[model samples]
Target: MDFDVKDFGAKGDGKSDDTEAIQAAIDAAYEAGGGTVRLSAGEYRVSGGDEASDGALMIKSNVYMDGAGMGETVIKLVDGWDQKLTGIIRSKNGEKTHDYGIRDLTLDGNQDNTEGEVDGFYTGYIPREDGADYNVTAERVEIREVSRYGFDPHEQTINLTIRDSVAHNNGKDGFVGDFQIDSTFENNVSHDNGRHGFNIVTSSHDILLRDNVAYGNGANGLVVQRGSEDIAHPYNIQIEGGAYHDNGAEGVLIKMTSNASLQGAEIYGNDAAGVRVRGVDGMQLLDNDIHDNAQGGGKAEIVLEDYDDRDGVSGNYYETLNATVQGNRVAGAAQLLSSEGRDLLDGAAGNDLLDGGAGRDTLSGGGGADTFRFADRQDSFRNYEGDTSRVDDIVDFTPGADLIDLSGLGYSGLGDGYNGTLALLLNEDGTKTYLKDRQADAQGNHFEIALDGNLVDSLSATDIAFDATQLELLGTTDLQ
Candidate 1:
């Protein structure tokens, strides 16, 4: 049954003091076996004497408070001191003992301009503490410009589903759940907060946050921390299917107080690393965009550190890195350092210096004047030495018009005593063939002695760096 408050003396006039009429209609609904308390089109000034009072509209069991729309109906919190302002719709009992639902309403806390001055927090519902569980569901809601937190859930406020809502411009975290069990926040947008956009602390297990966008927060976009003494830290928290970008700090901060798994997420363009992990284990980061977030004087992407005795980092993106660092481009010589594992240094498509510090890393120059530095590391292939007169063991030099393919040449294949000079002599006329045995020691190893049946068409010294102790090709034979 839909009971419109306007029909019961709660006028749609913006200046009307309709608190009594609205309360009377709500009381009548609760007395008549609980029905929907609907508010018609207009700005409903919810200012009693103190609007920040908790349970201002104490919704009974099986009741609903549906608004016409943000434009048609508005629930503004009248400013006052010593008041407890919270979510417009709240339950007095747990879900195990009651049934409650709130939807199709624009809960404009009217507190958007308070700037964190409220005493209480806002949320869809709060559970009772009488061995009873509560199930709360809020949908199609827009909670914007809040002074403090957007949503708050207390202990055992399980089975919460918030879908298709916008919680932006809050002073504190967006969706906060403390000691909550089995709650979910999906398809929501939370941006421009003072702290994390979504924070789950203390015993909040089986908390799933999916398909959400959290950006421009003061700190991390998503955070999970352990907070209770009796519950052994928050565990089994999963943050999936979200984009966390342009935050003031890290996109995601998992402090390792309990077991957590974050998958199929895109985290980028924050002021710090995309993800920071410390003092925890059994964490898996798969198929996520962790990039362009090094603005916090840290690694531009991911930072894995072992703060305490708990030290274990396995199967991250550092080795067979799967994340895309293309659109998350960083400029200049930014070094990604870690003590335990090697960092992935696949620079973007520009002039980049790729330094693979401590592993058998593979670096590919992706278009541009890129330099790869493997300082003090041996090449994959060793220099060959000693052999019979076997042309089978030698690589043939295919000379171009002016260049020789030394890629096929073996350095140590030339016998020990026959060490001499090796030079890529250029012709003044620009035609070339192989000339050999220019050794000062006069020892030679002739493999493919197939000359072009030619002499120097026109000679010019292209390079002189290949002269050895046995073959002094420089001043040893100077023909002025």
Candidate 2:
């Protein structure tokens, strides 16, 4: 059965108070078994106040609320609200509400009318005790101008699905899932929010945020954090295929999280680092288009700490999965220090300092006088003394335009004796060259370094450096 608000004396006129009439329709529908409370094309006014769960339209359980369309049916929250965590609509706060949904309606928070905080949709007993609410879905909805969050589900509100929706111009984050479980938000646009576009905080689990675009926000595009002690970490969170750009902070901040993977996404043009991770583990960055992140200020495109900071790369490892030289993972990406992986580190068109970590990697200083620093022998190649498959390939090693730094390895100066100095080897095939740096006075300490003959045509002995000292290239006699 369907209960229409019009039959309950609810005038959808802009000035009329339709709060009681709409409530009557919802209550009537709840009593007569599961049904829909339909609101036609009009702006229905509802009041707001300071109570935690009061002064808002309550969405009772087992009732599906329907509206005409996005621009046609408007549910506006009346102003003068000064509450900290009150909203225009919320799930029934007194008890468990399940199998409820709201779709095809424009939820206007009317921030100009509020004296203080007013959210759009507040669910699962936030600002109060943790209540039971599950299976709440919203589709094709337009939520805007809220003084606080747009669609916020706090505590153990599980099984939430929000799709093809838009949440913008809110006072805070557009979508916030605090301590949420088993939620999926797909193909949604969250931009111009006062804070983060999407925030999953305080230890949530099993969250899948896919193909959702987040841009032009006050804070990060997507921020996943373990803000509380409820769960051990924000676990099993996957952010897939989102275009996160031009945010006030990092495009993605994986803070205090575990098993969080950012895959198939484009992150760029952020004020801070493109991706900043701290206190994390089991993080995978796969096939992402993170580029051009530099702006008015200067900061690294990626903020993974150097090998020394990750405990000498003995255990904690982060990597770019399936990224190649022309894979479009990064462009104009300056100040990058990759973690342990077979990374494709390409500095497209700037003075980039790409210092890659342990793994078989590709370092291409695209167009500037770039510096490729080998922090340790292990960073340049896994098996430095041998293993053809473990060495880093410098795709474009311009004779004097590019530099390879062995300074971090602290090898002795040239002519410190041939057994303890740098040795350059031009391969017989004329396709490449191998340069070895003996890090110690021992013979077997010498490591292999290669440069592809893709552009430079030949590899000279003078291209590498040691603590600002150029290697002696005048030939220690020929080995032809």
Candidate 3:
């Protein structure tokens, strides 16, 4: 029972008043049952009179506070003094509470001397049928400025572990969870918070936000909201290896989730839309580095919208919409907007640029100098099998730094040198290179080129570059 708040008199010198000697050494270590409340390094100045204890350091249930590092143990929050301190280490009673912990400290919620809301480590939850709330931990903590949330764990928390923490600025959110269960927030650093710098809400389950580093933040730099589609939305969430930048909005905002997985993330710039999937279901945008992020233009650095109606039909409302964007690199001209299912756009490794803007897509451009773009021809639709028109797949094209720009598919008889009406054929066995629209005939309106899976056997009419003008054909034998 090591209760050393300077032997329960606590004058750790910040200007006296160590809040009734650190709540009388945490009520004399919870009446000699639970242990460790040792804070000795300096500056412990808490104000307000307990208002019936909601926390100015009131944590029981096998307590263990231990500070002496983070800025040499500072807990300052006594600038005005009256009686509305909601937290600075809370939870004296929430029932089922097990082995609690709070390491290295620096809670300092001196938000202009406190007023209304002030939480920096507040915890109160007890009713997952009255039996959840296991071994909790908040290591290497440094919850700053707090006027609102900065490490708040409310409602049925279980198996928690907020590691290597540093929840900054905080007037609102900098790591706030609600119905958390099986949590494990690692390598944390929720920045500039005033709102959302990791604000997870409702029915939080199996969460594992790893290597986190949410930036700037006034709103959304990681916000997983599930305000009830009947309470089951948040499941198996795993947002890995983060660096969600700028953040005023949508630097990862997944609403009404279901089996979320945003792996290897490095979501960029962020003014809006750098990963915003509303009403998701089995989402998985892997190998990310999504860039530019709708810096106030419109929206498209991954934006799949469907406000809700997890399919009960009628207007056929959103059938558990799916997502699986792979191997991403996504540079400035970013665009991967979906409205529904069938997504599997892949690209990465240097000079890449893709735009699979609608549903039913599977474009893969893996490796340098890639550009698979389309705006018309229904954005090259094949949607697998029932082909109607746009059938896109240039899997790997290194032909002189890869190039395929249909000039937005509006071919007309124009002039540059020699023109008949555009026709570049090399198909008789030299695989395939047919971009024929010589006023439409040998099968009509064509555009096909393949390599390595047959089709594209040595083509060189300058290897196809068309804006329709110089195609009275010369090399490649003028199509026999």
Candidate 4:
């Protein structure tokens, strides 16, 4: 079950070349009818210069290569006579039709920037139709500092499953899955790549990418593209559950004739729009937090107008305007860009710039620090049938850290002097209750909000009266 490559006369030197020994061990492991093949703590060198066979340890089926730890066990590529060698863990020919797995391994291509001649290009090939070429069901693998991609899934007939892995500092996309299908990539951290952190292209369908984090890349954090030049408009893709931060382009982009659905994600703190969708549609964004992005030449955070039909984005927090925003946190400088007939969840917070845009709509501020901007002052406070009047017409201008201007509604409150701080109390019987700040009168400042007599939400009496949503209040409950 456990075998060290060094015990088989394989050198741990950075230049001794352990391809043969490693491959023999792998073959022996497979012959034994499948078990764990552990690579004990050591360094493994791979070379291809002057040799007929290409360099790299091509892995076989039913074998798992577990490294000692990150940076402890390294499989490095050698540069030979102006030709740069490559090292990959690949499946053997006959092994392609069976289920094989590789996990807890580290591959480091210590490439020297000597402008090494390219002896061969990476052949984008993977087996499908009997079994998967790379059938990875492992977890917690780390592949970093490779001259090439950390993990390259090429023309693979089956899907690649990557979970709880970290791929960083690679020359290309950290994880590039092209020509794949039904792939599941979850809980992976991909960062600092030459291109997008992770790119899924080709006619790849039923792909599921979730709970992943991509940041600090040269392009978008995550990109879904149509890789094949012959194919057009690939559909039925889903991208959900990830955080894309500080990327060069959009945090997440669906581009180049690929159609996908997006839902239940948090994307923010990037250099560009949180999510920039172009070229196709049938997508949906639901119950996500998208904010603090779209800076300097970046498009709106969530763009729908530029794509196709039957796609909708609802129950999200979009904090930008001069953009098409519906069913999100409508508080920012961007314009509401939909052309009507769309369902909008205009959030309970933010300075919302609304232009009903030519359809019957439902709008409410819910409750929070809000600023409502409309075409005219009269149309602001009044509800509409085609244009009628109702009670919920006024955006609830809850006072808080950032109070949005509600002058468009033609009425103003006591201008921020309300001591709205409150607290929740727990009785001995285990019942819970709330106490208002005004209950203390002038001495309220003497005692901060406390829980079961424990102090919470600390602030001086000089702190202004601020009223947030019940959600926010419950989130910051204090004990009196």
Candidate 5:
């Protein structure tokens, strides 16, 4: 049955104190085996005193509070109450609250009136004890101007969904979910909060945050961390298709998380890094348009201090440290590539390309034919006697299938008639071929193309081509 608050003497006028009248309607509905308390188009002023000292309104199981519209039906905290309320709407019992919801209402905290920490709508228990509160939903609700958080659900809250809602201008976070399980926060807009826009911390699992906008906040736009030890570390988090921008801190900070995937996210223009990951494992950052972040100097677009990736960075364009580059359209210079460990730099499974930087790198064109690009003539220069730091071991270079592009180094062909100043010679060991620049003196400036510790018998001059038109290339040349 629908219980209208007007029948319980709730004068919807903005000046009237409707706290007792609204609570009486909720109590009447709960006594009659639970139903929805409907509010028509008007503003209800609820002060924290007398019967409603803890909260302006309390919710029970199998009950929900519905309004006509978000702006039409407003619930504001009355100014100048003696004690500070916990929240505008709160659950009476944590263990017994189930199948409760709140939608289509504007919950105003009246921040100028309250002195302590106040919230808009809150559920679950404090101190993080286990409870049976499950299947709660908050949709199409506008929670704003709260002292602390807009929607604060903490401790043993499970199967919660907050969709198509707006949480903005709160003193702390827009939505703070702590110790939650199986929560989905989708299509929500959280902006201009004093702290993090969406601060999901501690031990939350199986969280799916998609298509949300967290912008222009005082702190991080979206932050998820594993700061609790009572439960397992926060894992299985997926954030896809969100615009997290213009925050005071990082756009997204995934700290101490595992098995998380951030795909197709446009993270840019934040005050800090676009995405900062610390002490993370098994995280996949795929195809995200991350650029121009770290506006606050001393950070990169993606900063990974202690992360572990075995398969390499696949399809991501960002700065990395000791990371694998696999089939990605990487734009930056390859810094610290193949330092200590033998990094597998593979252009795998596509019409792929890679510019291997300075290291003992292993280049592989996996499956489809690939291209190994050399930008400068210095990139092709190597010392055959002592230093092997700049050598690239091409593990899978098919003679007719793949191509090595040295056109950017200005080498057209390899002869005296052409502009090429380099020559190739087969080694005495029959396993390596050296391309020596003819103008070099004692300081070695050459390239070593070696295969499997021996010379390739099928390799010929036809396998090598330059960018110049005039060609009188030779197979044998001596510089000794």
Candidate 6:
């Protein structure tokens, strides 16, 4: 480090102002074009500054701030500052403060003593006028007791990465970013904030959040949304391997977004759905463990909602368009819905209402009495695709316990529920022999649970039924 805080007369003794000394080092580093500034172990007390610095520590381009690790070198704001500060640390003037790094420091915003809103750290520039901020990294940092956000990066920032950090008990969200693109947040934790733990909004795109944890927040654990036409829509978001729990709302709420995916997440015990999405075009919820979210009287483990956006012509708001939720283990209960894709849904261990809306789907009701429901002719019929009936598979069909509901579905020639009036059609192809509905061939519908070639012999021994509405009695029917 070329510019040490002590060399600039920062006492850190709770006496004299460290603000001027710290600012001196920062200015020296900027004058050198690019350099490191060091702060040793101790509390550096600062106060509201003049208007030029926005009453907080201002960062310049190419200045890397290094401290003596968290809790060792604390930078805290003093009490009774008459003027309001924008944040503890931010860009000097919003004229492109890019390619900077801040690490190994704990930023305290003095929430109680501060008169006005003060964020722990805010870094962004006017994107439209100044272009987008790029190549900024913050690692091993913590922000506590901030009046507003702990880490708030906004205004069209790009290539921003925050790793191995923690933000807790902030007045607003722990981490919030708007108008951001191509950012990555990994191995971070944000909990117990006034708003969402992590809120990504205002049409941010191509963002990746991996191995993070969010819990006990005032609102949702993490929320990604874009509302109104003023802000562009959100798209191409990815959440990989995180634990989200015990929040006021859903563990993760992605509303009115497009092309998002959440995989391998351990999400549970939230107030609402583990993952809730609305008006999404393409989504993939895969290999997650979601359960026990009755804390706020949440009924379903996963909620995918679609709405009529133009009932009175208030724009074209819509429902969940298409998604694939597969290999997910859940508990308590689930109300899962999928539409218009080759979808795979598994309610591993609960009473679930798994409705595959259309297209070819593979459904599994793993350990409870479940309902394999259909609403359209294509819901159960994947036939007539160039000659081979590429039908949907009901992998776990427990007879007398599970039900296939065609109550309002486009399944013709049905008379009653599975109460002994249906026929089982055992067909043998060149490669395999399996059991199907005899009446379904005439009705132009296909229902199958062919785990293997010997399914016909196994299902024949059970009480199989096919009425005008419900069909029952099927098993794994695996072959030898």
> How many clashes show up per model?
9, 1, 3, 18, 4, 7
| lDDT of predicted model 1 | 0.53
Score residue 70 of candidate 6 by CA lDDT.
82
Alpha-carbon deviation at 122 in model 1, angstroms: 4.7
Tell me the tens digit of each residue's lDDT in model 1 across 294-410.
Answer: 576753355444434223232222222211122223332222222212233344433333433333333333333333332321211111242312211111121221212122233
- lDDT at position 176, candidate 5: 85
What's the TM-score of every candidate structure? 0.60, 0.78, 0.35, 0.63, 0.67, 0.84
Which is better, 1 or 2, measured by TM-score? 2
The TM-score, computed over Cα atoms with residue i paired to residue i, of candidate 2 is 0.78
Give a tens-digit lDDT track for model 6, residues 353-405: 76667666777778887776665544544243322344566777766566565
Residue-pair clash count for candidate 5 = 4
Query: What is each predicted model's overall lDDT from 0 to 1?
Result: 0.53, 0.73, 0.68, 0.53, 0.68, 0.74
Residue pairs with backbone atoms closer than 3 Å in model 5 (clashes): 412-468, 430-455, 431-454, 431-455
lDDT, residue 255, candidate 5 = 67
Best by TM-score: 6
Per-residue accuracy of model 5 over 1-480 as CA lDDT, tens digit each: 998999999998999999889888788888888899999999999876443336778887778889998887889988766465666898764455778888899998888876667888777755456564678899899998888889887666788899999999899899887767898999999999999988777778889998988998988899887653434558788888878988889888876666677767777778887777665544556666665666777324555544343243332222222334344322211111222223455543443344444445666655554555555555545664646556566766666555555555666555432245456556686666555455543566555444333324555445554543311232111100
Residue pairs with colliding backbones in model 3 are 380-390, 381-390, 432-456
Ranking by lDDT: 6, 2, 3, 5, 4, 1
State the lDDT of candidate 2 residue by residue for 347-455, as single tens digits. Answer: 6555567665677777787776667777776665424345576577777877766767776576664442255576665567877755655343233334556788833
Candidate 1 differs from the real structure by a C-alpha RMSD in angstroms, to one decimal, of 13.4
**Model 3 lDDT on a 0 to 1 scale:** 0.68
The sequence of per-residue lDDT tens digits that candidate 3 reaches over residues 170-225 is 89898888778888999898998887889778788899999898988887899887
Better of 4 and 5 by lDDT: 5
